[PDB]
Design a binder for this molecule. Sequence first.
Ligand SMILES: Nc1nc2c(ncn2[C@H]2C[C@H](O)[C@@H](COP(=O)(O)OP(=O)(O)OP(=O)(O)O)O2)c(=O)[nH]1
Ligand SMILES: [Mg+2]
Ligand SMILES: [Mg+2]
Ligand SMILES: [Mg+2]
Length: 342
Amino acid sequence: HMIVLFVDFDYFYAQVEEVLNPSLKGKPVVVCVFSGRFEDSGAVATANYEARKFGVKAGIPIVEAKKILPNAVYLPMRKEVYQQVSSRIMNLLREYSEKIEIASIDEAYLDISDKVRDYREAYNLGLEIKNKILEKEKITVTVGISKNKVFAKIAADMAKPNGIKVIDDEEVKRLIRELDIADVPGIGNITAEKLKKLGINKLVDTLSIEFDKLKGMIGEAKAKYLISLARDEYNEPIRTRVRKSIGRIVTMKRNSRNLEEIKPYLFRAIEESYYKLDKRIPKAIHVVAVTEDLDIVSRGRTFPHGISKETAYSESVKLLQKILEEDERKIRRIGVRFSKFI
DNA sequence: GGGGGAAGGATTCC
DNA sequence: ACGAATCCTTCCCCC
Ligand SMILES: Nc1nc2c(ncn2[C@H]2C[C@H](O)[C@@H](COP(=O)(O)OP(=O)(O)OP(=O)(O)O)O2)c(=O)[nH]1
Ligand SMILES: [Mg+2]
Ligand SMILES: [Mg+2]
Ligand SMILES: [Mg+2]
């Protein structure tokens, strides 16, 4: 049958940083996202291991990071750089299969069935690539291998960091029975919690529960996903993905509900989006506001034709007035998101 | 009943 | 105390 090779760059934003200024290596590095409300407001996007050991990981506030690691190095996130670096490395991989699916910015799936014969020869294609990237770009990555993508990826979770690990058919079997259901991709907290209830601690526990009861609990897509996966037969292919929407959301120096002080931030959002669209022309537009108590409200609109920048400016204002109208809370973060490209 | 599709919220992290 | 794919629920027009 089939073999998939999953590739995941290690602590990616932090590592492109150690590469551009090697002096940093060995020290605690933290790439931040300074929301600019007050010195050090914002969360951490990621940090190298020489700093993640103390709990400083993606998500925690930068103020909390400084209390733990007062003297670590804090850099702001430079997306475009990390982005052009990922692109280079993605090419490098095509020179191994042109059946490549690019998941996110730091990971890819390769279908190496027509280039390899077995897990012994695959492991080698594996080691070979890491080298081709540690030499060409200087970035270490982890590599997972197995039958379907899910497992290939789970393989990389275990081999992190700078690892490579194969998961052969005997392994699948034991994992389907031993692996913790929460460690299966696409199963965040809200779902693991809903599974505990139904009494499903493992992937296998799904073969002993009335499907229609499962469906109502977590949804049908998840039910079929999990069930087939457990029945040892998940096999979705490696298709090339495309950008389906682009957007930008920004944080205001302070809360508000005054359509006048909000307009500026909103046009910045729209501006940064239309630039980072390029060529592409959207038929749908949405406005998104994050209320004072961290909840999200959104209002959109689809047009029979594409949207001109000038129209974006105008429809964003209506949708924003629709939000402020139907909601009492103050708005904290405001932005836009374009979808349905022609 | 049931397709087709748009809206707005929920969930994930890839 | 910081971008986006996918899916679910709901509403709706129409045959
Ligand atoms: N802004 C922001 N960026 C995030 C967040 N989580 C992940 N990222 C970004 C920055 C990470 O470098 C990039 C790759 O994510 P990974 O999950 O693979 O983690 P990273 O590679 O940082 O560590 P890893 O070696 O995989 O354990 O995704 C987040 O919560 N906020
Ligand atoms: Mg990674
Ligand atoms: Mg990743
Ligand atoms: Mg999980």
